[PDB]
Write an enzyme that holds these catalytic residues in place. Structure first.
Site, PDB file in Angstrom:
ATOM      1  N   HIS A 319      19.745  80.557  73.892  1.00 24.58           N
ATOM      2  CA  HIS A 319      18.459  79.883  73.685  1.00 24.58           C
ATOM      3  C   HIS A 319      18.591  78.450  74.186  1.00 24.58           C
ATOM      4  O   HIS A 319      19.498  77.725  73.752  1.00 24.58           O
ATOM      5  CB  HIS A 319      17.997  79.910  72.220  1.00 24.58           C
ATOM      6  N   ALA A 320      17.688  78.048  75.088  1.00 28.87           N
ATOM      7  CA  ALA A 320      17.812  76.778  75.823  1.00 28.87           C
ATOM      8  C   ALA A 320      17.800  75.547  74.913  1.00 28.87           C
ATOM      9  O   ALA A 320      17.086  75.517  73.898  1.00 28.87           O
ATOM     10  CB  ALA A 320      16.714  76.671  76.871  1.00 28.87           C
ATOM     11  N   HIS A 349      10.417  71.411  80.771  1.00 26.57           N
ATOM     12  CA  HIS A 349      10.389  71.190  79.319  1.00 26.57           C
ATOM     13  C   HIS A 349      11.706  70.567  78.834  1.00 26.57           C
ATOM     14  O   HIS A 349      11.699  69.551  78.151  1.00 26.57           O
ATOM     15  CB  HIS A 349      10.096  72.486  78.539  1.00 26.57           C
ATOM     16  N   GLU A 350      12.830  71.174  79.199  1.00 24.90           N
ATOM     17  CA  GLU A 350      14.141  70.679  78.774  1.00 24.90           C
ATOM     18  C   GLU A 350      14.452  69.295  79.318  1.00 24.90           C
ATOM     19  O   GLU A 350      15.046  68.477  78.612  1.00 24.90           O
ATOM     20  CB  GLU A 350      15.254  71.652  79.174  1.00 24.90           C
ATOM     21  N   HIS A 353      13.005  66.380  77.248  1.00 25.14           N
ATOM     22  CA  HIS A 353      13.893  65.922  76.181  1.00 25.14           C
ATOM     23  C   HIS A 353      14.908  64.911  76.732  1.00 25.14           C
ATOM     24  O   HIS A 353      15.082  63.826  76.166  1.00 25.14           O
ATOM     25  CB  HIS A 353      14.644  67.097  75.555  1.00 25.14           C
ATOM     26  N   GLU A 377       8.683  67.349  72.042  1.00 27.04           N
ATOM     27  CA  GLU A 377       8.377  68.650  72.663  1.00 27.04           C
ATOM     28  C   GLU A 377       7.290  68.525  73.732  1.00 27.04           C
ATOM     29  O   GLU A 377       7.225  69.334  74.648  1.00 27.04           O
ATOM     30  CB  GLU A 377       7.961  69.676  71.592  1.00 27.04           C
ATOM     31  N   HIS A 479      14.320  80.198  66.072  1.00 26.55           N
ATOM     32  CA  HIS A 479      14.166  79.021  65.237  1.00 26.55           C
ATOM     33  C   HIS A 479      14.257  79.318  63.746  1.00 26.55           C
ATOM     34  O   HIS A 479      14.680  78.471  62.955  1.00 26.55           O
ATOM     35  CB  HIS A 479      12.832  78.354  65.560  1.00 26.55           C
ATOM     36  N   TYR A 489       5.969  72.205  67.613  1.00 29.73           N
ATOM     37  CA  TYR A 489       5.385  72.855  68.787  1.00 29.73           C
ATOM     38  C   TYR A 489       3.860  72.914  68.700  1.00 29.73           C
ATOM     39  O   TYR A 489       3.169  72.781  69.715  1.00 29.73           O
ATOM     40  CB  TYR A 489       5.995  74.249  69.015  1.00 29.73           C
TER      41      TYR A 489
END
Ligand SMILES: *[C@@H]1O[C@H](CO)[C@@H](O[C@@H]2O[C@H](CO)[C@@H](O[C@@H]3O[C@H](CO[C@H]4O[C@H](CO)[C@@H](O)[C@H](O)[C@@H]4O)[C@@H](O)[C@H](O[C@H]4O[C@H](CO[C@@H]5O[C@H](CO)[C@@H](O)[C@H](O)[C@@H]5O)[C@@H](O)[C@H](O)[C@@H]4O)[C@@H]3O)[C@H](O)[C@H]2NC(C)=O)[C@H](O)[C@H]1NC(C)=O
Ligand SMILES: O=C(N[C@@H](Cc1ccccc1)P(=O)(O)C[C@@H](Cc1cc(-c2ccccc2)no1)C(=O)N[C@@H](Cc1ccc(O)cc1)C(=O)O)OCc1ccccc1
Ligand SMILES: *[C@@H]1O[C@H](CO)[C@@H](O)[C@H](O)[C@H]1NC(C)=O
Ligand SMILES: *[C@@H]1O[C@H](CO)[C@@H](O)[C@H](O)[C@H]1NC(C)=O
Ligand SMILES: [Zn+2]
Length: 596
Positions: A319-320, A349-350, A353, A377, A479, A489
């Protein structure tokens, strides 16, 4: 108070000390997530226990300072952050047991393997990538139901007893911090005592659009699978929705598209044809951020990140995730990257962060986090909204021979809604469920059917097979097994449209009175104006309450569903009319798939 002189020196040293101690914990957590072994588990958990002990001493030492009496709002804000122990408030033995419980659940999830539907010899299929491949691509309803049941039995039911103890210790920790429950502990991160009501109000405004999308999708699924599989009046069988949790439906767009004879954007095939690699995908994400005059990825990122699933025998968490090591420029991603359209968006998305980490790394340790968890997020999703436009995809040669007429526009809006609107009730339910357990509102005898009742009530979906209190399905979502708060989210999906709209205006890419500049085709690539707004906001970290951070971006101070509704307004008009034209049934009867 003259003691404020010191107090300031005290905080200076302590912040620097916390960063260094947290670096050590983070390295051990990285080593375990990259390489799941009993030895790495032991090491991760022992170092966490060590840091928890130090935090106990810190919270104790704050009482030696009269911090509530101080003139400086900034000093008071830092001291307040240090009094908040979370799990570290637990007695030594209780903390160690919790850490053991958490790693049991996360490693169970990461280690799930199932047998092939067509070959009971082959039993090495993991969620990522094998099972997710079937769920997103197969249109064999029985094959889909098989993989659904195998996964949920192994990732969910298998950890009920551990999940039960986790809820107990989570509750005990919250109460030692004088929160009623962990629900209140989580909500504290938003610094707003009307936050739940605010989200209920925004959700109620968007719910009717969701119900129109739901009705149309169910109508189109009946035409594909027939009425023996999909009823007109009941919840949608969730395994037909192209995602293991039915959280986003874009994978079935090719069967539910408003205009099937007009283009539907799917660039995965072109990515492969052009020889895209994970490295290329990250380089492209880096390019997007730097094109907006934002910060380039440092050499540590390239040297130390894991951007492909390892090919040795090892167990790991796929999971990323994005990682901040609390030094200078030591930031990393671990992603089991695949060459798909969805994964191109995931990469951005990553990297959102990572950018936030780089933007606030000059802040004192306690301020090196998001303005609220939803902000963190949102960052990368704002860029992914641009990346996903026909406009951008044509620029990078991934979308060919595209004619953007009225029908193609509806197809693209609908495709976006299948991710952006569909997600909202899903995300709300992940935390409504856990909050209700945390608050002691559901008896243990009713825990499984309480999960499915929320999924029914809010999303109008249900399991493919009859479940009961002998199953335990919630931990089959990452999660939930990994104890990660989910409301972030929901907040993200609302505020990212506020950010996107404002960034598009700043870039000269959106004007509501100009037919040539629609919000749904905005590309902020290369915009220094948009980048400046991001710099102003992100560099603040958590130094100020979140409305101050929103204000730094676009002058607003209120979380609002206005922007997301504006984006989807042309779809709403078209869809309401289409559902009437086709006599499409809206709403659903109560599910029969969870037995008391
Ligand atoms: C969550 O809520 C909890 C309450 O439900 C809270 O627990 C309370 O914390 C208090 C500390 O803030 C603590 O208060 C102390 O009580 C001592 C005696 O209590 C005993 O008897 C109780 C039964 O009657 C038992 O239940 C207890 O276990 C104890 O055995 C007092 O001796 C103590 O006093 C000293 O400290 C005060 C505070 O001084 C402050 O700072 C400066 C001094 O530099 C002052 O100038 C300033 O004005 C301020 O008052 C001094 O005034 C005094 O002279 C003494 O030095 C103190 O009052 C309380 O006992 C405790 N429990 C309960 C049940 O009340 C948790 O702390 C909360 N948790 C979190 C994380 O916030
Ligand atoms: O690495 C994370 N968080 C990861 C999860 C996590 C949290 C704690 C510990 C370990 C891991 P993620 O959310 O990046 C991991 C990402 C992975 C992902 C992204 C996308 C994506 C698809 C299309 C478009 C855009 C994005 N699909 O999956 C995640 O979970 N996403 C949610 C849902 C989601 C979010 C956004 C979205 O657009 C779509 C879906 C999920 O998998 O359920 O947080 C770092 C951090 C945040 C804040 C402070 C400090 C550090
Ligand atoms: C994983 O950890 C084990 C022992 O915990 C160690 O021997 C090994 O080097 C690690 N594997 C990899 C691929 O790094
Ligand atoms: C790029 O960002 C820097 C950071 O301050 C700024 O000074 C500079 O003016 C920006 N460039 C442009 C073209 O806006
Ligand atoms: Zn994220």
């Amino acid at each position: 108070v003259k003691e404020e002189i010191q107090a300031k020196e005290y905080l200076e040293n302590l912040n620097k000390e916390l960063a260094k101690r947290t670096n050590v914990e983070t390295e051990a957590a990285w080593a375990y997530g990259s390489n799941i072994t009993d030895e790495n588990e032991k090491k991760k958990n022992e170092i966490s226990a060590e840091l928890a002990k130090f935090m106990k001493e810190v919270a104790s030492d704050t009482t030696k300072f009269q911090w509530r009496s101080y003139q400086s709002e900034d000093l008071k804000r830092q001291f307040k952050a240090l009094t908040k122990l979370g799990y570290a408030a637990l007695p030594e033995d209780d903390y160690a047991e919790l850490l053991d419980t958490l790693s049991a659940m996360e490693s169970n999830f990461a280690k799930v393997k199932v047998c092939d539907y067509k070959d009971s010899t082959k039993c090495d299929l993991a969620l990522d990538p094998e099972i997710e491949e079937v769920i997103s691509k197969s249109r064999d309803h029985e094959e889909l139901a098989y993989y659904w049941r195998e996964f949920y039995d192994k990732a969910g039911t298998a950890v009920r007893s551990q999940f039960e103890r986790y809820v107990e210790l989570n509750t005990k920790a919250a109460k030692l911090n004088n929160f009623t429950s962990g629900a209140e502990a989580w909500l504290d991160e938003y610094e707003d005592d009307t936050f739940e009501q605010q989200l209920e109000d925004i959700f109620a405004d968007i719910r009717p659009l969701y119900q129109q999308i739901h009705g149309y999708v169910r109508f189109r699924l009946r035409k594909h699978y027939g009425d023996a599989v999909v009823s007109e009046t009941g919840p949608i069988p969730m395994h037909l929705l192209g995602n293991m949790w039915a959280q986003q439906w874009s994978e079935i767009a090719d069967i539910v598209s408003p205009f099937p004879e007009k283009p539907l954007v799917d660039v995965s095939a072109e990515m492969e044809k052009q020889g895209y690699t994970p490295l290329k995908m990250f380089q492209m994400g880096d390019d997007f951020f730097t094109s907006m005059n934002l910060t380039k990825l440092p050499q540590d990122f390239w040297d130390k990140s894991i951007i492909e699933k390892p090919t040795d025998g090892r167990d790991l968490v796929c999971h990323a995730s994005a990682w901040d090591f609390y030094l200078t420029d030591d930031v990393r991603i671990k992603q089991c990257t695949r060459v798909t359209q969805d994964q191109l968006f995931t990469v951005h998305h990553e990297l959102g962060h990572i950018q936030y980490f780089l933007q606030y790394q000059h802040q004192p340790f306690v301020y090196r986090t998001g303005a609220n968890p939803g902000f963190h997020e949102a960052v990368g999703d704002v860029l992914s909204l641009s990346v996903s436009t026909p406009k951008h995809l044509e620029k990078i040669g991934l979308l060919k021979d595209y004619v953007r007429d009225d029908e193609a526009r509806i197809n693209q809006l609908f495709l976006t809604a299948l991710d952006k609107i569909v997600f909202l009730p899903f995300a709300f339910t992940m935390d409504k469920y856990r909050w209700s357990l945390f608050r002691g509102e559901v008896d243990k005898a009713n825990w499984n059917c309480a999960f499915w009742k929320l999924r029914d009530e809010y999303s109008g979906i249900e399991p493919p097979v009859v479940r009961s209190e002998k199953d335990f399905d919630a931990p089959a979502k990452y999660h939930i097994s990994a104890d990660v708060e989910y409301l972030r989210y929901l907040v993200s999906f609302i505020i990212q449209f506020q950010f996107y709209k404002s960034a598009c205006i700043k870039a000269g890419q959106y004007d509501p009175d100009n037919v040539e500049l629609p919000l749904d085709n905005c590309d902020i690539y290369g915009s220094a104006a948009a980048g400046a707004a991001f710099h102003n906001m992100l560099s603040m970290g958590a130094s100020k309450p979140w409305p101050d951070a929103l204000e730094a971006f676009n002058g607003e101070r209120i979380m609002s569903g206005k922007a997301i509704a504006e984006y989807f307004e042309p779809l709403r008009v078209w869809l309401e009319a289409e559902n009437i034209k086709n006599n499409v049934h809206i709403g659903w009867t109560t599910s029969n798939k969870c037995v008391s």
